[PDB]
Amino acid sequence: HSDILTCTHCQAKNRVGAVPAGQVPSCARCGAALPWLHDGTDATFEQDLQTSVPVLVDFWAPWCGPCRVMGPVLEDLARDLPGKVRVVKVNVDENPRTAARFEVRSIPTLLMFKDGEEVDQMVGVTQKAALRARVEHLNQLS
Ligand SMILES: [Zn+2]
Protein backbone atom coordinates (compact mmCIF):
# COMPACT_ATOMS: atom_id res chain seq x y z
CA HIS A 1 0.00 0.00 0.00
CA SER A 2 1.37 3.42 -1.02
CA ASP A 3 0.24 7.05 -0.87
CA ILE A 4 1.37 10.31 -2.46
CA LEU A 5 3.05 12.68 0.00
CA THR A 6 3.61 16.13 -1.48
CA CYS A 7 6.80 17.94 -0.56
CA THR A 8 6.08 21.28 1.12
CA HIS A 9 9.28 22.79 -0.21
CA CYS A 10 9.64 21.81 -3.87
CA GLN A 11 6.13 20.43 -4.61
CA ALA A 12 7.42 17.02 -5.66
CA LYS A 13 4.86 14.21 -5.46
CA ASN A 14 6.46 11.32 -3.54
CA ARG A 15 4.85 7.86 -3.64
CA VAL A 16 5.63 6.40 -0.21
CA GLY A 17 4.49 3.11 1.31
CA ALA A 18 6.26 1.15 4.03
CA VAL A 19 9.01 3.08 5.80
CA PRO A 20 11.98 1.30 7.44
CA ALA A 21 11.87 1.87 11.20
CA GLY A 22 14.26 4.56 12.41
CA GLN A 23 13.66 6.58 9.22
CA VAL A 24 11.01 9.09 8.19
CA PRO A 25 9.82 9.79 4.63
CA SER A 26 11.85 12.44 2.84
CA CYS A 27 11.47 14.12 -0.58
CA ALA A 28 13.49 12.30 -3.25
CA ARG A 29 14.02 15.50 -5.25
CA CYS A 30 15.11 17.98 -2.58
CA GLY A 31 15.66 15.88 0.58
CA ALA A 32 13.19 17.71 2.88
CA ALA A 33 11.16 15.69 5.40
CA LEU A 34 7.66 15.06 4.06
CA PRO A 35 4.27 15.70 5.75
CA TRP A 36 3.65 12.13 6.78
CA LEU A 37 -0.11 11.70 6.46
CA HIS A 38 -1.78 8.78 4.71
CA ASP A 39 -4.58 6.19 4.79
CA GLY A 40 -4.23 3.10 6.95
CA THR A 41 -6.08 -0.23 6.62
CA ASP A 42 -6.77 -3.29 8.72
CA ALA A 43 -4.01 -4.90 6.62
CA THR A 44 -1.37 -2.16 7.16
CA PHE A 45 -2.15 -0.98 10.69
CA GLU A 46 0.43 -3.06 12.54
CA GLN A 47 3.14 -1.83 10.17
CA ASP A 48 1.91 1.78 10.44
CA LEU A 49 2.60 1.57 14.19
CA GLN A 50 6.24 0.40 13.71
CA THR A 51 7.93 3.79 13.80
CA SER A 52 9.64 5.87 16.46
CA VAL A 53 7.75 9.13 15.90
CA PRO A 54 4.33 9.65 17.56
CA VAL A 55 1.58 7.98 15.52
CA LEU A 56 -1.73 9.80 15.39
CA VAL A 57 -4.53 7.46 14.26
CA ASP A 58 -7.66 9.32 13.07
CA PHE A 59 -10.83 7.18 12.97
CA TRP A 60 -13.20 8.97 10.62
CA ALA A 61 -16.15 8.36 8.34
CA PRO A 62 -17.74 10.16 5.36
CA TRP A 63 -21.01 10.76 7.23
CA CYS A 64 -19.32 12.29 10.32
CA GLY A 65 -19.77 16.07 10.45
CA PRO A 66 -16.83 17.03 12.69
CA CYS A 67 -14.51 14.83 10.54
CA ARG A 68 -14.85 17.37 7.71
CA VAL A 69 -13.36 19.95 10.13
CA MET A 70 -10.73 17.65 11.63
CA GLY A 71 -9.30 16.56 8.25
CA PRO A 72 -7.77 19.97 7.40
CA VAL A 73 -6.43 20.36 10.96
CA LEU A 74 -4.52 17.07 10.73
CA GLU A 75 -3.26 18.07 7.29
CA ASP A 76 -1.86 21.31 8.75
CA LEU A 77 -0.41 19.42 11.72
CA ALA A 78 1.57 17.05 9.50
CA ARG A 79 2.76 19.97 7.32
CA ASP A 80 3.88 21.95 10.40
CA LEU A 81 5.67 18.94 11.99
CA PRO A 82 7.07 17.14 8.95
CA GLY A 83 8.68 13.88 9.98
CA LYS A 84 7.87 14.45 13.66
CA VAL A 85 4.44 12.76 13.53
CA ARG A 86 2.79 10.08 11.41
CA VAL A 87 -0.91 10.72 10.79
CA VAL A 88 -2.76 7.54 9.84
CA LYS A 89 -6.34 8.02 8.61
CA VAL A 90 -8.59 4.99 9.21
CA ASN A 91 -11.96 5.08 7.43
CA VAL A 92 -14.10 3.02 9.83
CA ASP A 93 -16.56 2.24 7.01
CA GLU A 94 -13.77 0.23 5.39
CA ASN A 95 -11.69 -1.00 8.41
CA PRO A 96 -14.01 -2.59 10.96
CA ARG A 97 -11.41 -4.86 12.58
CA THR A 98 -9.19 -1.98 13.75
CA ALA A 99 -12.18 0.13 14.83
CA ALA A 100 -13.48 -2.80 16.91
CA ARG A 101 -9.99 -3.54 18.26
CA PHE A 102 -9.76 -0.10 19.87
CA GLU A 103 -13.42 -0.06 20.95
CA VAL A 104 -14.23 3.00 18.86
CA ARG A 105 -17.64 4.45 19.77
CA SER A 106 -17.55 8.12 18.69
CA ILE A 107 -16.54 9.46 15.30
CA PRO A 108 -14.05 11.12 15.08
CA THR A 109 -11.78 9.38 17.52
CA LEU A 110 -8.07 10.28 17.60
CA LEU A 111 -5.65 7.86 19.30
CA MET A 112 -1.99 8.63 19.86
CA PHE A 113 0.59 5.82 19.91
CA LYS A 114 4.22 5.76 20.90
CA ASP A 115 6.33 2.65 20.20
CA GLY A 116 3.17 0.63 19.51
CA GLU A 117 1.34 1.56 22.73
CA GLU A 118 -1.73 3.76 23.05
CA VAL A 119 -0.72 6.85 25.03
CA ASP A 120 -3.56 9.27 24.37
CA GLN A 121 -7.17 9.41 23.22
CA MET A 122 -9.24 12.39 22.06
CA VAL A 123 -12.93 12.14 21.21
CA GLY A 124 -14.54 14.80 19.06
CA VAL A 125 -13.03 17.95 17.64
CA THR A 126 -9.68 18.94 19.20
CA GLN A 127 -7.88 22.25 18.72
CA LYS A 128 -4.78 22.05 16.55
CA ALA A 129 -2.61 23.78 19.19
CA ALA A 130 -3.43 21.09 21.78
CA LEU A 131 -2.52 18.40 19.24
CA ARG A 132 0.75 20.11 18.37
CA ALA A 133 1.61 20.41 22.08
CA ARG A 134 0.95 16.73 22.74
CA VAL A 135 3.02 15.74 19.71
CA GLU A 136 6.05 17.86 20.66
CA HIS A 137 5.69 16.57 24.23
CA LEU A 138 5.86 12.98 22.93
CA ASN A 139 8.83 13.95 20.78
CA GLN A 140 10.72 14.55 24.03
CA LEU A 141 10.76 10.73 23.67
CA SER A 142 8.91 9.49 26.69
ZN1 LIG B 1 11.06 18.39 -2.18
**CATH number of the domain residue 96 falls in:** 3.40.30.10
Is residue 96 a known part of a binding site?
A: no
The answer to the question of whether 116 is labelled as a binding residue is no
- How far away, in angstroms, is 34 Cα from ligand 1 center? 8
Q: What is the Å distance from ligand 1's center to 24 Cα?
A: 14
64 is catalytic: yes
Residue 86 sits at the vertex; the CA angle it makes with 54 and 28, to the nearest 5 degrees, is 130
Helix 65-80 / helix 128-139 crossing angle, nearest 10 deg: 40
58 inside domain: yes
Buried b (16+ CB within 10 A) or exposed e, 3-35: eebebbeeebebebeebeeeebbbbeeeeebbb
The answer to whether position 127 is within a domain reads yes
Question: Could you say which of 16, 32, 64, 73 is catalytic?
Answer: 64
If one counts the domains in the chain, the total is: 1
Catalytic residue among 34, 37, 56, 67: 67
- d(CA 135, CA 133) in angstroms, rounded, equals 5
Give me the phi and psi of 71, to 5 degrees please.
-50, -60
* CA 7 / ligand 1 centre spacing (Å): 5
Q: Give a yes or no: residue 61 inside a domain.
A: yes
CA of 25 to the centre of ligand 1 (A): 11
Domain presence at residue 105: yes
* Three-class secondary structure assignment of the chain: CCEEEECCCCCCEEEECCCCCCCCCECCCCCCECCCEEECCCCCHHHHCCCCCCEEEEEECCCCHHHHHHHHHHHHHHHHCCCCCEEEEEECCCCHHHHHHCCCCCCCEEEEEECCEEEEEEECCCCHHHHHHHHHHHHCCC
139 is in an annotated binding site: no
12 part of a folded domain: no
- Resolution in Å, one decimal, please: 1.9
Residue 92 CA to ligand 1 center (angstroms) comes to 32
